[PDB]
């Protein structure tokens, strides 16, 4: 779209949109990020605080698989199992409970965020959290671990 640019509308003006006193020369202020500590100090002290220095411990052959742990809330814990199981579970008078698997659906740890509707559940997981365990113990139902 050469025809929509700016330089096609500047053919005729002498300076081409970069002044006449201080012309558009090649590199006035160094090349790249030159002068973090000397003369571009204010931009980094005002927009990138803590650009400079070291902190903490080093860790050499770091993998990203020993610390793999996706999460989930109690809000959408019912979204894994289809709708007609939550219905039959709220419909039967017997006192049974539908088993929810998270590891099968690509989640490990169960955190707790929101309100939860009152019907008994059984959760198989690998970890928990203390609020997210006392909301299920408070509604009724258990919290089952699995390796």
């Amino acid at each position: 779209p050469s025809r929509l640019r700016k330089t096609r509308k500047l053919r005729g003006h002498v300076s081409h949109g970069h002044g006449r006193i201080g012309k558009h020369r090649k590199h006035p202020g160094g090349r790249g990020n030159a002068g973090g500590m000397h003369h571009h100090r204010i931009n980094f002290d005002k927009y990138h605080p803590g650009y400079f220095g070291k902190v903490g411990m080093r860790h050499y052959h770091l993998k990203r698989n020993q610390s793999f742990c996706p999460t989930v809330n109690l809000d959408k814990l019912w979204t894994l199992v289809s709708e007609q199981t939550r219905v039959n579970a709220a419909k039967n008078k017997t006192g049974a409970a539908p088993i929810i698997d998270v590891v099968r659906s690509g989640y490990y740890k169960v955190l707790g965020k929101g309100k939860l509707p009152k019907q008994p559940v059984i959760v198989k997981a690998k970890f928990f959290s203390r609020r997210a365990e006392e909301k299920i113990k408070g509604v009724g139902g258990a919290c089952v671990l699995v390796a």
């Binding site: 690998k126 089952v144 671990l145 699995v146 390796a147």
Partner: protein, 102 residues
Amino acid sequence: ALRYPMAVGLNKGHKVTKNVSKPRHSRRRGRLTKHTKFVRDMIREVCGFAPYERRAMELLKVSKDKRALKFIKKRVGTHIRAKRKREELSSVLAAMRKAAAK
């Protein structure tokens, strides 16, 4: 109470049974043979010892073993190879002491 296979702790992991199969043959390299000892000691009986150990025997006759350890660790390598060398020269020192005591 109830117990679950906990995925963190002391004996973690999914409980799966285990079989006892024959260990792989390559798992044995040259452990030793009787023919080997037969000939490696005959060549030891032909040629003697090196001149970094014809001083170690002479410092292990005065019951110094720390000094002859820093003297065979400086030459040969680590402290493990120094130990299995020293426990061997307390033997081929004591077989002369045994035969001279005989």
